Amino acid sequence: GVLYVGSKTKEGVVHGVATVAEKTKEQVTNVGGAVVTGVTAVAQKTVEGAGSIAAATGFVKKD
Amino acid sequence: GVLYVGSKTKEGVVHGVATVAEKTKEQVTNVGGAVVTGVTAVAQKTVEGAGSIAAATGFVKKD
Amino acid sequence: GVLYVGSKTKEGVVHGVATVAEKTKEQVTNVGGAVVTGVTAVAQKTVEGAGSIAAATGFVKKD
Amino acid sequence: GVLYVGSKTKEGVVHGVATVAEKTKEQVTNVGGAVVTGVTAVAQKTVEGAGSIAAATGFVKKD
Amino acid sequence: GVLYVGSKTKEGVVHGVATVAEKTKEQVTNVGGAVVTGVTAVAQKTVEGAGSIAAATGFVKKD
Amino acid sequence: GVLYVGSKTKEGVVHGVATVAEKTKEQVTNVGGAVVTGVTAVAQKTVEGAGSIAAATGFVKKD
């Protein structure tokens, strides 16, 4: 179907994904999949059919 | 169907996903899947059919 | 069906997902799935059919 | 002496001298002398000594 | 003496002297002398000593 | 004396002297003398001593 996205913006500031760590021992940072950001952000039909986004984090630490 | 998204904004500030950790030992940060952010954010039909977003975090620590 | 989203905003400030941790030992942060944020945020038909978003956190710690 | 004029303004709109006439026969418009206008308007020591501003209008119409 | 004029403005709109006449027979427009206008308008010591600004309008119409 | 004129402006619009006449028979327009206009307008010591600005308009019409 028709999807109209109109916008008349002025002085637009956008921050996306932020991450801060400090005084840590082990650091893991997994980002992605469908990260869309911006003044005019559109994300249509991310997954269709048998598709998948397995954005996991297999932290095992088999001590 | 028709989806109209009109906007007349001025001086728009948007912050998305934020994460802060301090004095930690183990750090895990998993972000994503359908992270959409911004002054005009649209997310239509994220999942259709047999699709999936398994944005999990397999923290085991098999001590 | 028709979905009209009109907006006439001025000086709009939006904060999305925030997380703060301090003096912790183990840190886990799982975010996502359908995180939409912004001055004009629209999220239509997140899941249709047999789809799913298994945004879980398998914290085991099998001590 | 010290004259401090501080200002922290945002979106300032200033209109000065306005004059509107309609369906008239004789029109006279005399403006001036010390017309100061604006967001930060300062007018110090307009007249000192034997000076003068004879901003008059000698409309006679000696019929 | 010291005269400090500080200003931190944003989106400043200033209009000075305006004059509108319509359907008139005789039109006279005399402007000036010390017409100062603007976002940061300063007018110091306009007249000193025996000086003068004779911004008059000698409309006689000796009928 | 010291005269400090500081300014930190953004998107500054300034209009000076304006004059509009319509459907008139006789038109006279005298402007000047010390017409200063602008975003940072300064007019110091316009007249000193025996000086003068005779910005008049000798409209006689000796009918």
GROMACS .gro file of C-alpha atoms in nm:
model
  378
    1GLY     CA    1   0.000   0.000   0.000
    2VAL     CA    2   0.089   0.367  -0.033
    3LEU     CA    3   0.301   0.495   0.258
    4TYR     CA    4   0.360   0.871   0.256
    5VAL     CA    5   0.625   1.011   0.492
    6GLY     CA    6   0.634   1.391   0.478
    7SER     CA    7   0.853   1.606   0.699
    8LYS     CA    8   0.940   1.977   0.724
    9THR     CA    9   1.201   1.995   1.000
   10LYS     CA   10   1.456   2.259   1.100
   11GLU     CA   11   1.762   2.206   1.324
   12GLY     CA   12   1.717   1.835   1.383
   13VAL     CA   13   1.964   1.647   1.603
   14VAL     CA   14   1.940   1.268   1.628
   15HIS     CA   15   2.150   1.025   1.833
   16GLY     CA   16   2.125   0.652   1.769
   17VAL     CA   17   2.259   0.366   1.980
   18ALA     CA   18   2.496   0.466   2.260
   19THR     CA   19   2.696   0.246   2.494
   20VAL     CA   20   2.933   0.340   2.777
   21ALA     CA   21   3.138   0.101   2.992
   22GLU     CA   22   3.400   0.187   3.251
   23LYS     CA   23   3.627  -0.007   3.491
   24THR     CA   24   3.510  -0.339   3.347
   25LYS     CA   25   3.706  -0.664   3.306
   26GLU     CA   26   3.529  -0.834   3.013
   27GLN     CA   27   3.360  -0.624   2.744
   28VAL     CA   28   3.120  -0.746   2.475
   29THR     CA   29   2.931  -0.518   2.236
   30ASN     CA   30   2.703  -0.666   1.969
   31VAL     CA   31   2.490  -0.418   1.772
   32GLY     CA   32   2.307  -0.438   1.443
   33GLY     CA   33   2.031  -0.635   1.274
   34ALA     CA   34   1.809  -0.346   1.163
   35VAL     CA   35   1.959  -0.041   1.333
   36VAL     CA   36   1.805   0.254   1.147
   37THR     CA   37   1.848   0.609   1.273
   38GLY     CA   38   1.823   0.963   1.141
   39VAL     CA   39   1.600   1.265   1.101
   40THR     CA   40   1.375   1.074   0.857
   41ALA     CA   41   1.409   0.706   0.949
   42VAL     CA   42   1.195   0.448   0.768
   43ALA     CA   43   1.212   0.071   0.817
   44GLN     CA   44   0.953  -0.121   0.614
   45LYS     CA   45   0.924  -0.502   0.597
   46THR     CA   46   1.225  -0.595   0.809
   47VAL     CA   47   1.156  -0.971   0.789
   48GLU     CA   48   0.941  -1.157   0.536
   49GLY     CA   49   0.911  -1.530   0.483
   50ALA     CA   50   1.125  -1.778   0.673
   51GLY     CA   51   1.401  -1.522   0.728
   52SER     CA   52   1.548  -1.434   1.066
   53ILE     CA   53   1.799  -1.205   1.236
   54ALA     CA   54   1.977  -1.410   1.504
   55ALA     CA   55   2.151  -1.113   1.664
   56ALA     CA   56   2.246  -1.311   1.975
   57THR     CA   57   2.559  -1.314   2.192
   58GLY     CA   58   2.691  -1.659   2.283
   59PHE     CA   59   2.878  -1.559   2.599
   60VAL     CA   60   2.973  -1.900   2.739
   61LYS     CA   61   3.269  -1.863   2.978
   62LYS     CA   62   3.293  -2.239   3.029
   63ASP     CA   63   3.496  -2.220   3.351
   64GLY     CA   64  -0.361   0.058   0.317
   65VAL     CA   65  -0.265   0.424   0.289
   66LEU     CA   66  -0.052   0.545   0.581
   67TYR     CA   67   0.014   0.920   0.584
   68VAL     CA   68   0.281   1.052   0.822
   69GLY     CA   69   0.296   1.431   0.813
   70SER     CA   70   0.519   1.641   1.036
   71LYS     CA   71   0.613   2.009   1.066
   72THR     CA   72   0.874   2.020   1.342
   73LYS     CA   73   1.134   2.278   1.446
   74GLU     CA   74   1.438   2.217   1.669
   75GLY     CA   75   1.387   1.846   1.724
   76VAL     CA   76   1.630   1.652   1.942
   77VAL     CA   77   1.599   1.272   1.962
   78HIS     CA   78   1.805   1.024   2.164
   79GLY     CA   79   1.774   0.652   2.096
   80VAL     CA   80   1.902   0.361   2.303
   81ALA     CA   81   2.141   0.454   2.584
   82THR     CA   82   2.336   0.227   2.817
   83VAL     CA   83   2.575   0.314   3.100
   84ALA     CA   84   2.775   0.069   3.313
   85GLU     CA   85   3.039   0.146   3.573
   86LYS     CA   86   3.262  -0.054   3.811
   87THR     CA   87   3.140  -0.383   3.663
   88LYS     CA   88   3.330  -0.710   3.618
   89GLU     CA   89   3.150  -0.873   3.323
   90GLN     CA   90   2.985  -0.657   3.057
   91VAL     CA   91   2.743  -0.772   2.786
   92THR     CA   92   2.559  -0.538   2.549
   93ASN     CA   93   2.328  -0.679   2.281
   94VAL     CA   94   2.120  -0.424   2.087
   95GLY     CA   95   1.937  -0.438   1.757
   96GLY     CA   96   1.657  -0.627   1.585
   97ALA     CA   97   1.440  -0.334   1.478
   98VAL     CA   98   1.596  -0.033   1.652
   99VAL     CA   99   1.447   0.267   1.469
  100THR     CA  100   1.497   0.619   1.599
  101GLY     CA  101   1.478   0.975   1.471
  102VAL     CA  102   1.260   1.281   1.434
  103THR     CA  103   1.031   1.097   1.188
  104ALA     CA  104   1.059   0.728   1.276
  105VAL     CA  105   0.841   0.476   1.092
  106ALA     CA  106   0.852   0.098   1.137
  107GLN     CA  107   0.589  -0.087   0.931
  108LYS     CA  108   0.554  -0.467   0.909
  109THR     CA  109   0.853  -0.568   1.120
  110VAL     CA  110   0.777  -0.942   1.096
  111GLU     CA  111   0.560  -1.121   0.841
  112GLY     CA  112   0.523  -1.493   0.782
  113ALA     CA  113   0.733  -1.748   0.970
  114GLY     CA  114   1.013  -1.496   1.028
  115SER     CA  115   1.161  -1.415   1.367
  116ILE     CA  116   1.416  -1.193   1.541
  117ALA     CA  117   1.590  -1.404   1.806
  118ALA     CA  118   1.769  -1.112   1.970
  119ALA     CA  119   1.860  -1.316   2.278
  120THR     CA  120   2.173  -1.327   2.496
  121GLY     CA  121   2.298  -1.674   2.582
  122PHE     CA  122   2.487  -1.582   2.899
  123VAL     CA  123   2.576  -1.926   3.036
  124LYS     CA  124   2.872  -1.897   3.276
  125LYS     CA  125   2.890  -2.274   3.322
  126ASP     CA  126   3.093  -2.262   3.644
  127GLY     CA  127  -0.724   0.112   0.637
  128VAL     CA  128  -0.624   0.476   0.614
  129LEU     CA  129  -0.409   0.591   0.907
  130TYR     CA  130  -0.338   0.965   0.914
  131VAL     CA  131  -0.069   1.091   1.153
  132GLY     CA  132  -0.049   1.470   1.149
  133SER     CA  133   0.176   1.674   1.374
  134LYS     CA  134   0.275   2.041   1.409
  135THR     CA  135   0.536   2.045   1.685
  136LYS     CA  136   0.799   2.298   1.792
  137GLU     CA  137   1.103   2.231   2.014
  138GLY     CA  138   1.046   1.860   2.065
  139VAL     CA  139   1.287   1.660   2.280
  140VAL     CA  140   1.252   1.281   2.297
  141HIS     CA  141   1.454   1.027   2.495
  142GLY     CA  142   1.418   0.657   2.423
  143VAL     CA  143   1.542   0.362   2.627
  144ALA     CA  144   1.782   0.448   2.909
  145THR     CA  145   1.975   0.216   3.139
  146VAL     CA  146   2.215   0.296   3.423
  147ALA     CA  147   2.411   0.046   3.633
  148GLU     CA  148   2.676   0.117   3.894
  149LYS     CA  149   2.897  -0.089   4.130
  150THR     CA  150   2.770  -0.414   3.978
  151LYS     CA  151   2.956  -0.744   3.929
  152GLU     CA  152   2.773  -0.901   3.632
  153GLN     CA  153   2.611  -0.680   3.368
  154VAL     CA  154   2.368  -0.788   3.096
  155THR     CA  155   2.187  -0.549   2.862
  156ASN     CA  156   1.955  -0.683   2.592
  157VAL     CA  157   1.750  -0.424   2.401
  158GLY     CA  158   1.567  -0.431   2.071
  159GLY     CA  159   1.285  -0.615   1.898
  160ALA     CA  160   1.072  -0.317   1.793
  161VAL     CA  161   1.232  -0.020   1.971
  162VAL     CA  162   1.086   0.283   1.791
  163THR     CA  163   1.140   0.634   1.926
  164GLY     CA  164   1.126   0.991   1.802
  165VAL     CA  165   0.912   1.300   1.769
  166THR     CA  166   0.682   1.122   1.521
  167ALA     CA  167   0.705   0.752   1.604
  168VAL     CA  168   0.483   0.505   1.417
  169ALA     CA  169   0.489   0.126   1.457
  170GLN     CA  170   0.224  -0.053   1.249
  171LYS     CA  171   0.184  -0.432   1.223
  172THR     CA  172   0.481  -0.539   1.433
  173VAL     CA  173   0.401  -0.912   1.404
  174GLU     CA  174   0.181  -1.086   1.147
  175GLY     CA  175   0.140  -1.457   1.084
  176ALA     CA  176   0.346  -1.716   1.270
  177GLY     CA  177   0.629  -1.469   1.330
  178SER     CA  178   0.778  -1.394   1.670
  179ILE     CA  179   1.036  -1.177   1.846
  180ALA     CA  180   1.207  -1.394   2.109
  181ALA     CA  181   1.390  -1.106   2.276
  182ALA     CA  182   1.479  -1.314   2.582
  183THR     CA  183   1.791  -1.332   2.800
  184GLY     CA  184   1.912  -1.682   2.882
  185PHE     CA  185   2.101  -1.596   3.200
  186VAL     CA  186   2.186  -1.942   3.333
  187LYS     CA  187   2.483  -1.920   3.573
  188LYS     CA  188   2.495  -2.298   3.615
  189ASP     CA  189   2.698  -2.293   3.937
  190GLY     CA  190   2.960   5.584   3.448
  191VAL     CA  191   2.962   5.215   3.362
  192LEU     CA  192   2.644   5.101   3.184
  193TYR     CA  193   2.619   4.725   3.132
  194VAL     CA  194   2.349   4.596   2.895
  195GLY     CA  195   2.340   4.216   2.891
  196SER     CA  196   2.087   4.011   2.700
  197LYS     CA  197   2.032   3.642   2.622
  198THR     CA  198   1.729   3.636   2.392
  199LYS     CA  199   1.588   3.376   2.153
  200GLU     CA  200   1.337   3.438   1.871
  201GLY     CA  201   1.303   3.813   1.916
  202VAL     CA  202   1.069   4.010   1.690
  203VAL     CA  203   1.068   4.390   1.710
  204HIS     CA  204   0.856   4.642   1.519
  205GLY     CA  205   0.943   5.011   1.531
  206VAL     CA  206   0.735   5.307   1.415
  207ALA     CA  207   0.427   5.220   1.210
  208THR     CA  208   0.185   5.452   1.033
  209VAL     CA  209  -0.126   5.371   0.828
  210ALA     CA  210  -0.348   5.620   0.643
  211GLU     CA  211  -0.637   5.547   0.410
  212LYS     CA  212  -0.889   5.751   0.207
  213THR     CA  213  -0.715   6.076   0.302
  214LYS     CA  214  -0.677   6.396   0.098
  215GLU     CA  215  -0.358   6.551   0.241
  216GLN     CA  216  -0.085   6.328   0.384
  217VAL     CA  217   0.214   6.436   0.592
  218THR     CA  218   0.459   6.197   0.759
  219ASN     CA  219   0.756   6.332   0.956
  220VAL     CA  220   0.960   6.075   1.150
  221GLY     CA  221   1.308   6.079   1.298
  222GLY     CA  222   1.516   6.269   1.552
  223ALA     CA  223   1.633   5.977   1.765
  224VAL     CA  224   1.432   5.680   1.638
  225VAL     CA  225   1.616   5.376   1.778
  226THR     CA  226   1.467   5.029   1.754
  227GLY     CA  227   1.581   4.669   1.771
  228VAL     CA  228   1.628   4.367   1.993
  229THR     CA  229   1.904   4.546   2.189
  230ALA     CA  230   1.829   4.918   2.158
  231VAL     CA  231   2.046   5.167   2.348
  232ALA     CA  232   2.016   5.547   2.330
  233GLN     CA  233   2.256   5.730   2.563
  234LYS     CA  234   2.297   6.109   2.583
  235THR     CA  235   2.060   6.211   2.305
  236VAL     CA  236   2.108   6.586   2.365
  237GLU     CA  237   2.392   6.759   2.549
  238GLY     CA  238   2.469   7.129   2.567
  239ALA     CA  239   2.271   7.386   2.370
  240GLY     CA  240   2.173   7.130   2.105
  241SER     CA  241   1.818   7.060   1.997
  242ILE     CA  242   1.609   6.838   1.768
  243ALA     CA  243   1.336   7.056   1.616
  244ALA     CA  244   1.142   6.767   1.465
  245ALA     CA  245   0.835   6.981   1.399
  246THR     CA  246   0.586   6.994   1.111
  247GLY     CA  247   0.501   7.341   0.984
  248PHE     CA  248   0.163   7.258   0.833
  249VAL     CA  249   0.031   7.605   0.747
  250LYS     CA  250  -0.239   7.579   0.478
  251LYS     CA  251  -0.271   7.956   0.453
  252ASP     CA  252  -0.613   7.954   0.285
  253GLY     CA  253   3.242   5.615   3.050
  254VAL     CA  254   3.250   5.244   2.970
  255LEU     CA  255   2.934   5.124   2.793
  256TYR     CA  256   2.913   4.747   2.746
  257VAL     CA  257   2.645   4.611   2.511
  258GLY     CA  258   2.641   4.232   2.512
  259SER     CA  259   2.390   4.020   2.324
  260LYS     CA  260   2.340   3.649   2.251
  261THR     CA  261   2.037   3.637   2.021
  262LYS     CA  262   1.899   3.372   1.786
  263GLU     CA  263   1.647   3.426   1.503
  264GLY     CA  264   1.609   3.801   1.544
  265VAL     CA  265   1.372   3.992   1.315
  266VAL     CA  266   1.365   4.373   1.330
  267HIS     CA  267   1.150   4.619   1.135
  268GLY     CA  268   1.232   4.989   1.142
  269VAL     CA  269   1.021   5.281   1.023
  270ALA     CA  270   0.713   5.188   0.820
  271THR     CA  271   0.468   5.414   0.639
  272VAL     CA  272   0.159   5.326   0.436
  273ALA     CA  273  -0.067   5.569   0.248
  274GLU     CA  274  -0.356   5.489   0.016
  275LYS     CA  275  -0.610   5.687  -0.190
  276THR     CA  276  -0.440   6.016  -0.099
  277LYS     CA  277  -0.406   6.333  -0.307
  278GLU     CA  278  -0.090   6.494  -0.167
  279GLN     CA  279   0.187   6.277  -0.021
  280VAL     CA  280   0.484   6.392   0.186
  281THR     CA  281   0.733   6.159   0.355
  282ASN     CA  282   1.028   6.300   0.550
  283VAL     CA  283   1.235   6.049   0.748
  284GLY     CA  284   1.583   6.059   0.895
  285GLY     CA  285   1.788   6.255   1.146
  286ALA     CA  286   1.910   5.967   1.364
  287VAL     CA  287   1.712   5.666   1.241
  288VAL     CA  288   1.901   5.367   1.384
  289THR     CA  289   1.756   5.017   1.365
  290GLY     CA  290   1.875   4.659   1.387
  291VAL     CA  291   1.926   4.361   1.613
  292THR     CA  292   2.200   4.546   1.806
  293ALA     CA  293   2.120   4.917   1.770
  294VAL     CA  294   2.334   5.171   1.957
  295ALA     CA  295   2.299   5.550   1.933
  296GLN     CA  296   2.536   5.739   2.164
  297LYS     CA  297   2.572   6.119   2.179
  298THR     CA  298   2.334   6.214   1.899
  299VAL     CA  299   2.377   6.590   1.955
  300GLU     CA  300   2.659   6.770   2.136
  301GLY     CA  301   2.731   7.141   2.149
  302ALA     CA  302   2.529   7.393   1.949
  303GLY     CA  303   2.435   7.131   1.688
  304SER     CA  304   2.080   7.055   1.580
  305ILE     CA  305   1.874   6.828   1.355
  306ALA     CA  306   1.598   7.041   1.200
  307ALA     CA  307   1.409   6.747   1.053
  308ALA     CA  308   1.098   6.956   0.985
  309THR     CA  309   0.849   6.961   0.697
  310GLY     CA  310   0.760   7.306   0.565
  311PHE     CA  311   0.422   7.216   0.415
  312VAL     CA  312   0.286   7.560   0.325
  313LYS     CA  313   0.016   7.527   0.056
  314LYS     CA  314  -0.021   7.904   0.027
  315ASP     CA  315  -0.363   7.894  -0.141
  316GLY     CA  316   3.520   5.645   2.653
  317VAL     CA  317   3.533   5.274   2.577
  318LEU     CA  318   3.219   5.147   2.402
  319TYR     CA  319   3.204   4.769   2.359
  320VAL     CA  320   2.938   4.626   2.126
  321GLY     CA  321   2.939   4.247   2.132
  322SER     CA  322   2.691   4.030   1.946
  323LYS     CA  323   2.646   3.657   1.878
  324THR     CA  324   2.344   3.638   1.648
  325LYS     CA  325   2.210   3.368   1.416
  326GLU     CA  326   1.957   3.415   1.133
  327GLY     CA  327   1.913   3.790   1.168
  328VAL     CA  328   1.674   3.975   0.938
  329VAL     CA  329   1.662   4.355   0.948
  330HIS     CA  330   1.443   4.596   0.750
  331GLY     CA  331   1.520   4.967   0.753
  332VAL     CA  332   1.304   5.255   0.630
  333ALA     CA  333   0.998   5.155   0.428
  334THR     CA  334   0.750   5.375   0.245
  335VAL     CA  335   0.441   5.281   0.042
  336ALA     CA  336   0.213   5.518  -0.149
  337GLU     CA  337  -0.075   5.431  -0.379
  338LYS     CA  338  -0.332   5.623  -0.588
  339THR     CA  339  -0.167   5.955  -0.501
  340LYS     CA  340  -0.138   6.270  -0.713
  341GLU     CA  341   0.177   6.437  -0.574
  342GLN     CA  342   0.456   6.226  -0.426
  343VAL     CA  343   0.752   6.348  -0.220
  344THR     CA  344   1.003   6.120  -0.048
  345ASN     CA  345   1.297   6.268   0.145
  346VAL     CA  346   1.508   6.022   0.346
  347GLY     CA  347   1.855   6.039   0.493
  348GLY     CA  348   2.058   6.241   0.741
  349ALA     CA  349   2.183   5.958   0.963
  350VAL     CA  350   1.990   5.652   0.843
  351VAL     CA  351   2.183   5.358   0.990
  352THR     CA  352   2.043   5.006   0.975
  353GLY     CA  353   2.167   4.649   1.001
  354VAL     CA  354   2.222   4.355   1.231
  355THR     CA  355   2.494   4.547   1.422
  356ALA     CA  356   2.409   4.915   1.382
  357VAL     CA  357   2.618   5.175   1.565
  358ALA     CA  358   2.578   5.553   1.537
  359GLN     CA  359   2.813   5.749   1.765
  360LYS     CA  360   2.843   6.129   1.776
  361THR     CA  361   2.604   6.217   1.495
  362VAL     CA  362   2.641   6.595   1.546
  363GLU     CA  363   2.920   6.781   1.725
  364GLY     CA  364   2.987   7.153   1.733
  365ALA     CA  365   2.782   7.399   1.530
  366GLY     CA  366   2.691   7.133   1.272
  367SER     CA  367   2.338   7.051   1.166
  368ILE     CA  368   2.135   6.818   0.944
  369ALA     CA  369   1.856   7.025   0.786
  370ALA     CA  370   1.671   6.726   0.642
  371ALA     CA  371   1.357   6.930   0.572
  372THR     CA  372   1.108   6.928   0.284
  373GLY     CA  373   1.014   7.270   0.147
  374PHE     CA  374   0.677   7.173  -0.001
  375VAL     CA  375   0.537   7.515  -0.096
  376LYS     CA  376   0.267   7.474  -0.364
  377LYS     CA  377   0.224   7.850  -0.398
  378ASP     CA  378  -0.117   7.834  -0.565
   0.00000   0.00000   0.00000
